[PDB]
RNA sequence: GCCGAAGUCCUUCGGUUAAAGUUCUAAUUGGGACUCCCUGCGUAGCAGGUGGAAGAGGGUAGCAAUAACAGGUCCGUGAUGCCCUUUAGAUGCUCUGGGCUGCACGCGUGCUACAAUGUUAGGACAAUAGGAGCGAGCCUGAGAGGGUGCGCUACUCUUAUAAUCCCUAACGUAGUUGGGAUUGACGUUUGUAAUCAGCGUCAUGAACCAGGAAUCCCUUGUAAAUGUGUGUCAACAACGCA
């Protein structure tokens, strides 16, 4: 056991003994598709275990997910893109998402939009029936 | 602190409807391309007139049936009587309610409140 | 017993399909025929697919397969190829349906092949040229010896 | 229960697998993960390491399952 | 001379087989040289009860379409005479090729 | 008269009614029949449809 | 019709049915007609009662190992698994598979059973080799479900111990419960 | 010398076509080694293992799926060998006996076809599921 | 048999109003199976067997007596008796908008799963329908989509190289590359309208480790799995009929 599991990076603690692009999925905001796009563009091997990744290599992967548009990415494959407030396409990650999505729910309640009500009441929003299902 | 697409309140008012609709959601610029004319034009005529007459108090209500109009910066801070199929429900417009469907703020149904047994 | 031909040497029909198509994939990576596109590399083969391909050199093994499948059906359209390389749609709660492949990935190849003259266009779909079906029976006698 | 094996092959256990694996007449990845307490992803890649060097031929090359033997010269 | 096709269509087979006999019969008299297409079942499957009551039972209504094609070389003089059968629920499209 | 709501591609267009029925509850559009089913099955043998 | 051998590997020359025992062998279906190159066949075996005897025995296993609800049909899958048993059987022990197979089909299916007090009836030889193949294959999938191990192996683990009469086996454990229940009720 | 006969399972139909030649048997445009399975390789050759060095057979197919398309070819090979010896009789009756000893499907074929779907149910004979009470 | 392309001495493709046909394809007229045949059992018939494409109503459907249920339908009808409505501030008809989709909860039919007999990635055969709407081929875009509109009044042209299965890899018994609900945003099509429609994209990554007492369907090309058409339809199938 020269290597380390339980590796802390980007405010989460992603797993080791778990092959890289699945390991980066433990972060909120990088998922299975975008994780492959980082590693492919990292660019190394998806299969290699997050056991290893020697810190000079790891410092690359954090620079990619923070600066995606910059690092040779199409932008269609981004978490936010064209945000109304900033009017700019950059994609959210880590502990931000759980706090920053909450604002986009909170602002609906202040407006009294139809969505903002059904978040507050704890019901289904998108136009599902709730006669029988959801109890 | 308010921006729409990294653009403040008055420069959205300055740039007019034609360039504005380049940066609505692509659900919504379909409604501007197809089926904008006549019914819609009267609205922003009438929401100009109630806005002009005011200057502390907020203006008189501009009643309207049609629920499926985009909210634009041009009519911010008007009052609108929006029909629920029942009553013209009245909403003073905020900056955060830009670029949305006008129906959303007239909810057609009651919340519920469940009682009792049966 | 086993099937036996005439004609001594090997042809594109004869040798097995899993083997032949990968030998013809290698025969583009050495020669610089086809090339990779540069825009692509992250794209799903088809919208229905849930992830990118594993192989990273996947572009060529597709580009081999289409030339193999122009050979076996003589004509090959784009919309005919798109229907072929699709599959069932796996995720959603409903029952599963056949959706099509991407067009652009397949179009990119069939233009890149007509640079090095391996497939002419014609009436109906595209049909491979005298240069083209020669290149298959090069590789048939490469893997026929093996 | 939570019967967790392990993702790492150690330098000690490699010296064991040279001795006792080629003694077995037919053995798969499945039966390594019984004895040496390891993941099958490693136990597949251990056998394909041994066959490239010397000893250990695949008895069956079939897709899905694989099962390795001795090396009769 | 503009080798002409008949195309004979029907609902019912006995009513068809009269017309085929006549239009084959008349090419014996005129002496014009004489050269079955696959039949369709137009299945419409209505629920037979009017209301929603009762066990869901379904009548099947096949309309059948028998279709034959005679054709021959013929000089416009001879063909006017042959065309003129007149049966219930039979059709005869004439087609020049 | 002349009802002003468009009804181009719509369930209560005047083409879409049972021709005999004058009502649209359960319409058979296939083969351009445009006939209501209860209306159909009274008078299906006249049209040349049959049970087999 | 000179070699005549299963999967193009094994032969039926062996298997000494006379040698195996008295009775039981008859409904075994390994007698010449039964031998075939591949156990796959166009069956017409469910038409009239005893026609199940005249089919090959190795096929009859591949049908049992077709469950449940996902593996229904897909016989062409099952005859890979039974192949990849019969490699593991042959190349481990060095016996050929068909001899050690039919010994498994002998000793699984219990003599006697509780006919619904409850009374202990005897069995037909037909119903023995039926409830051989069930209680083998039941144990295989019950073991193989969730187990990180290929079912071809988990067949071969079951199938060796059925021949040697061990209480490792899900077959030969479950008979000694069922046979003792018949002895108790009686 | 040439004979042209068919096999048929389920809704496969495979025609074969004997000539004189030098022991070539050819599915579609290719030798019947190449079916890519290892089960269904050995299934098509069951006719030939029992019993053609004169003959040259040329087989074409449509219909069915993967399995029933093979079972047509076993009919079409075996019947075309038997139909060759019948035309071109002593030896035909005894080589045909070797097939009918093995299995009846190599000459006869089977007439079973799928039962039509009936209303009130998802298939032919199944019905949906009752409630009561 | 001709003329092509490769192979490069005889193998495989594509084309052909060009000579002979009918094994596949299409559909009309007839033939065919009757317990006739043999052996057992009890004349009526029954059980097994040979042959036979098929053997016991050849398989599956369709049609289906008399006698009734105050079962259903006046929301199918220019089928209809009576009652009231026509006081037009109509229970006639029609326009804008909203409902039938509202949710502490209880039941019915279904769908997708709980994985390794698997999923992921790459590679390698159907039938029945429908279509003056289907929509060929070729360009454009990651994708959905978009533009141009060849053939077909259809065994000719078109929806249309189906999916389990098969063969090479990856994974490794974990609520895990199992599972894909619920939510945020962007990219679009159909439409007078998307506010409760469908499709795409990237993120979010839930309950579920095979289900108590109970209950349902099924005997052979049947069950179960596995897709494809069609009905409704501008758009939308987890449903019905095939």
Resolution (angstroms) equals 3.3
CB contact at 8 A, A130 and A123: yes
Q: Do E44 and F30 touch (CB under 8 A)?
A: yes
List the E49 CA – I68 C1' distance (angstroms): 20
List the E38 CA – I165 C1' distance (angstroms): 34
Task: Find which of D30, D35, D58, D72 to mutate to test the G interface (most G CBs within 10 Å of its CB).
Answer: D30
Q: Cα dist. B22→B12, B28, B71, G163, H36 in Å?
A: 12, 10, 15, 79, 57
Structural domain that includes position A83: 75-135
At G102 the three-state DSSP class reads: helix
DSSP secondary structure code for residue D63 in this structure = S
What count of residues does chain G have?
Answer: 186
Tell me the C-alpha distance between D70 and D57, whole Å. 6
Tell me the C-alpha distance between F45 and E6, whole Å. 29
- Per the structure, how many domains does chain E have? 1
Alpha-helical regions (H) of C6-129: 17-29, 58-72, 78-85, 104-112
Q: Do A111 and B3 touch (CB under 8 A)?
A: no
Residue E13: CB less than 7 A from any atom in strand I: yes
CB contact at 8 A, C113 and C63: yes
Of G7, G42, G76, the CB nearest to H105: G42
Structural domain that includes position C116: 1-146
Tell me the C-alpha distance between A18 and D47, whole Å. 21
At H4 the three-state DSSP class reads: strand
Residue B66: CB less than 7 A from any atom in strand I: yes
Query: Which residues, at least 6 apart from A40, have a Cβ–Cβ distance to it below 8 Å?
Result: A46, C41, C42, C52, C56
Tell me the C-alpha distance between B28 and B100, whole Å. 8
State the nucleotide closest to G145 in CA–C1' terms: I116
Same domain, A8 and A67: yes
CB contact at 8 A, E87 and E23: no
Lookup: tokens for B28? 């919504």
Angle at E19 between CA E14 and CA E22, to 5 degrees: 130
At H104 the three-state DSSP class reads: helix
F contacts of E11 (beta carbons < 8 Å)? 48
- Give helix C78-85 / helix C104-112 axis angle, nearest 10°: 130
List the H2 CA – I22 C1' distance (angstroms): 15
H contacts of C1 (beta carbons < 8 Å)? 45, 48-49
Q: Which of residues 28-57 of H touch strand I (CB under 7 A)?
A: 28-29, 36-38
Preceding omega of H110 cis (within 30 degrees of 0) = no
DSSP string, E63-80: EEEEEE--EE---SHHHH
Q: Map tokens 């040289």 to a residue.
A: E33
A contacts of C41 (beta carbons < 8 Å)? 40
CB contact at 8 A, C34 and C113: yes
Tell me the C-alpha distance between F15 and F29, whole Å. 10
Tell me the C-alpha distance between A62 and C72, whole Å. 48
Tell me the C-alpha distance between E56 and E48, whole Å. 8
Q: Map tokens 């496969």 to a residue.
A: H12
The full set of domain ranges for chain F reads 1-52
CB contact at 8 A, G100 and G89: yes
The H or E element spanning position C119 is strand C119-120
> Which sign, positive or negative, has the C-alpha torsion H19, C11, C110, C41?
positive
At E24 the three-state DSSP class reads: helix
For chain D, say whether A51 makes contact (Cβ under 8 Å). Answer: yes
CB contact at 8 A, E27 and E72: yes
Residue F35: CB less than 7 A from any atom in strand I: no
Where on strand I do bases come within 7 A of a protein Cβ?
5-14, 23-29, 48-49, 53-54, 59-63, 71-73, 75-78, 94-113, 115-132, 136-145, 154-155, 159-177, 179-205, 215-234, 237-242
CB contact at 8 A, F11 and F34: no
List the H12 CA – I136 C1' distance (angstroms): 30
Tell me the C-alpha distance between G169 and G177, whole Å. 13
Alpha-helical regions (H) of C30-145: 58-72, 78-85, 104-112, 130-145
* CA D54 to the chain's CA centroid: 14
List the C54 CA – I221 C1' distance (angstroms): 41
At C146 the three-state DSSP class reads: coil
Same domain, A28 and A11: yes
CB contact at 8 A, A61 and A44: no
For chain H, say whether E56 makes contact (Cβ under 8 Å). Answer: yes
Tell me the C-alpha distance between D21 and C146, whole Å. 32
CB contact at 8 A, A119 and A108: yes
| Residue G11, beta-bridge partner list | G5
CB contact at 8 A, H5 and H16: yes
List the A61 CA – I143 C1' distance (angstroms): 26
Q: Do A40 and C52 touch (CB under 8 A)?
A: yes
For chain G, say whether D62 makes contact (Cβ under 8 Å). Answer: yes
Closest CA to B73 of B94, B98, B50, B91: B98
| Residue E7, beta-bridge partner list | E93
Q: Which residues of A fall below an 8 Å CB-CB distance to C?
A: 32-33, 36-37, 40-41, 74, 77
Q: Cα dist. E63→B24, E13, E60, F48 in Å?
A: 55, 12, 10, 6
Q: Do H119 and E55 touch (CB under 8 A)?
A: no
Report A:11-50 residues touching B (Cβ under 8 A): none
Chains C and D touch (3+ CB pairs under 8 A): no
Residue nearest to nucleotide I182 (CA to C1'): A124
Q: Map tokens 């936010």 to a residue.
A: A80
Angle at A67 between CA A66 and CA A70, to 5 degrees: 170
State the nucleotide closest to H66 in CA–C1' terms: I125
Preceding omega of B101 cis (within 30 degrees of 0) = no
Give residue C133's region: left, alpha or beta (phi > 0; psi -120 to 50).
Answer: alpha
Chains G and H touch (3+ CB pairs under 8 A): yes
| Residue H60, beta-bridge partner list | H15
CB contact at 8 A, C114 and C33: no
Of F31, F37, F51, the CB nearest to E42: F31
Residue F47: CB less than 7 A from any atom in strand I: no
Lookup: tokens for G149? 């191990």
Same domain, A5 and A64: yes
| Residue C119, beta-bridge partner list | C128
Alpha-helical regions (H) of chain A: 32-40, 55-66, 95-111, 114-121
Angle at H39 between CA H33 and CA H40, to 5 degrees: 50
Q: Report the first-to-last Cα separation within chain E, whole angstroms.
A: 9
For H83, other C-beta atoms within 10 Å of its C-beta total 16
Domain containing G147 — which CATH number?
Answer: 1.10.455.10
List the A36 CA – I237 C1' distance (angstroms): 35
Give the pairing of strands H12-20 and H30-31: unpaired
Domain containing E73 — which CATH number?
Answer: 3.30.70.600
How was this structure obtained? Answer: cryo-EM
- Per the structure, how many domains does chain H have? 1
Please report, for chain E, how many H helices and E strands are present, in that order: 2, 5
Structural domain that includes position H36: 1-133
Residue F28: CB less than 7 A from any atom in strand I: yes
For chain E, say whether F51 makes contact (Cβ under 8 Å). Answer: yes
Same domain, A63 and A95: no
CATH T-level fold of F1-52: 30s Ribosomal Protein S14; Chain N (4.10.830)
Is residue B68 packed enough to be buried (19+ CB in 10 Å), middle (13-18) or exposed (0-12)? Answer: exposed
Same domain, A35 and A91: no
Name all contacts of G166-174 with Cβ < 8 Å and 24+ positions apart: G169/G108, G169/G139, G170/G135, G170/G136, G170/G138, G170/G139, G170/G140, G170/G142, G170/G143, G171/G104, G171/G107, G171/G108, G171/G132, G171/G135, G171/G136, G171/G139, G172/G107, G172/G108, G174/G135, G174/G139
């Amino acid at each position: 056991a020269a290597f380390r599991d339980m590796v802390r990076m980007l405010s989460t603690n992603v797993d080791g003994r778990r092959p890289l692009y699945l390991a980066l999925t433990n972060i909120s905001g990088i998922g299975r598709r975008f994780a492959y796009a980082v590693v492919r563009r990292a660019g190394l091997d998806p299969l290699r275990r997050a056991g290893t990744l020697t810190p000079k290599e790891e410092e690359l992967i954090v620079s990619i997910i923070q600066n995606p548009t910059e690092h040779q990415i199409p932008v269609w494959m981004l978490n936010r893109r064209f945000d109304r407030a900033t009017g700019q396409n950059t994609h959210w990650v880590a502990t931000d998402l759980g706090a920053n999505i909450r604002a986009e729910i909170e602002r609906m309640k202040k407006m009294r939009m139809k969505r903002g009500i059904r978040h507050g009441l704890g019901l289904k929003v998108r136009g599902q029936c709730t006669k029988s299902t959801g109890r | 602190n308010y921006t729409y697409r990294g653009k403040t309140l008055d420069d959205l008012r300055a740039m007019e409807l034609k360039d504005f609709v380049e940066l609505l959601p692509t659900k919504r610029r379909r409604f501007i391309s197809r089926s904008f004319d006549l019914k819609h034009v009267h609205l922003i005529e009438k929401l100009k007139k109630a806005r002009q007459a005011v200057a502390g108090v907020r203006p008189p209500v501009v009643k309207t049936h049609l629920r499926h109009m985009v909210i634009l910066p041009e009519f911010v801070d008007n009052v609108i009587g929006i029909y629920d199929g029942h009553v013209f429900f009245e909403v003073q417009i905020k900056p955060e309610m830009i670029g949305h469907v006008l129906a959303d703020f007239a909810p057609s149904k009651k919340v519920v409140k469940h009682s009792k047994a049966g | 017993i086993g099937g036996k031909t005439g004609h001594k040497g090997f042809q594109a029909r004869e040798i097995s399909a899993d083997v032949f198509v990968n030998a013809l994939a290698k025969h583009f990576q050495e020669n610089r025929i086809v090339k990779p596109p540069e825009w692509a590399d992250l794209v799903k083969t088809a919208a229905l697919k849930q992830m990118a391909p594993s192989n990273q050199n996947w572009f060529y093994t597709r580009a081999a397969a289409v030339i193999r499948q122009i050979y076996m059906h003589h004509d090959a359209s784009l919309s005919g190829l798109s229907f072929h390389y699709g599959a069932n749609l796996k995720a959603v709660t409903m029952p599963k349906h056949h959706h099509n492949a991407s067009r652009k990935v397949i179009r990119s190849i069939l233009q890149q092949l007509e640079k090095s003259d391996l497939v002419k266009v014609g009436e109906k779909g595209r049909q491979l040229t005298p240069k083209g079906q020669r290149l298959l029976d090069q590789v048939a006698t490469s893997c026929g010896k093996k | 229960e939570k019967r967790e094996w392990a993702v790492i092959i150690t330098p000690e256990q490699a010296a064991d697998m040279v001795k006792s694996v080629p003694k077995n007449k037919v053995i798969s990845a499945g039966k390594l993960a019984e004895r040496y307490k390891i993941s099958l992803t490693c136990a597949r890649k251990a056998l394909e390491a041994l066959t490239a060097e010397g000893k250990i031929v695949p008895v069956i090359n079939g897709h899905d399952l694989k099962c390795y033997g001795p090396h009769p010269d | 001379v503009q080798k002409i096709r008949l195309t004979i269509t029907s609902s019912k087979l006995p009513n068809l087989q009269r017309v085929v006999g006549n239009l084959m019969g008349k090419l014996k008299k005129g002496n014009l040289e004489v050269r079955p297409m696959p039949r369709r079942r137009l299945r419409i499957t209505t629920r037979r009860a009017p209301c929603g009551n009762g066990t869901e039972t379904y009548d099947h209504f096949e309309l059948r379409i028998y279709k034959r094609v005679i054709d021959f070389q013929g000089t416009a003089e001879a063909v006017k005479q042959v065309t003129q059968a007149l049966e219930p629920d039979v059709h005869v499209e004439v087609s020049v090729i | 008269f002349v009802p002003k709501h468009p009804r181009d591609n719509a369930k209560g267009s005047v083409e879409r009614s049972c021709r005999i029925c004058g009502k649209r509850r359960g319409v058979i559009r296939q083969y351009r029949l445009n006939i209501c089913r209860r209306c159909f099955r009274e008078r299906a043998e006249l049209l040349g449809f049959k049970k087999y | 019709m000179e070699g005549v051998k299963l999967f193009g590997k094994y032969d039926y020359s062996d298997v000494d049915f006379s040698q195996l025992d008295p009775a039981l062998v008859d409904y075994i279906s390994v007698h010449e007609k039964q031998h075939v190159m591949v156990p796959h066949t166009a069956g017409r075996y469910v038409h009239k009662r005893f026609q199940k005897v005249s089919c090959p025995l190795v096929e009859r296993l591949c049908n049992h190992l077709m469950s449940r609800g996902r593996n229904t049909g897909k016989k062409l899958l099952a005859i890979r698994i039974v192949e990849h048993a019969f490699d593991i059987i042959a190349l481990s022990t060095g016996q050929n598979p068909i001899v050690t197979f039919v010994k498994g089909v002998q000793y699984c299916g219990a003599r006697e059973d509780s006919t619904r007090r409850r009374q202990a009836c005897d069995v037909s030889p037909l119903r023995r080799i039926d409830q051989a193949l069930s209680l083998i294959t039941e144990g295989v999938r019950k073991a193989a479900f969730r187990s990180s191990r290929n079912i071809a192996e988990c067949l071969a683990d079951e199938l060796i111990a059925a021949s040697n009469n061990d209480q490792t086996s899900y077959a030969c454990r479950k008979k000694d419960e069922l046979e003792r229940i018949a002895k108790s009720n009686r | 010398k040439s004979v042209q006969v068919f096999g048929r399972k389920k809704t496969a139909t495979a025609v074969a076509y004997c000539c004189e030649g030098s022991g070539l048997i050819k599915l579609n445009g290719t030798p019947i080694n190449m079916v890519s399975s290892e089960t269904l390789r050995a299934k098509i050759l069951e006719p030939l293992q029992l019993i053609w060095g004169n003959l040259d057979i040329r087989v074409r197919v449509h219909g069915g799926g993967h399995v029933a398309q093979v079972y047509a070819i076993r009919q079409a090979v075996a019947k075309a060998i038997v139909a060759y010896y019948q035309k071109y009789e002593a030896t035909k009756t005894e080589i045909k006996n070797t097939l009918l000893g093995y299995d009846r499907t190599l000459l006869v074929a089977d007439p079973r076809r799928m039962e039509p779907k009936k209303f009130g149910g998802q298939g032919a004979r199944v019905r949906r599921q009752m409630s009561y009470r």
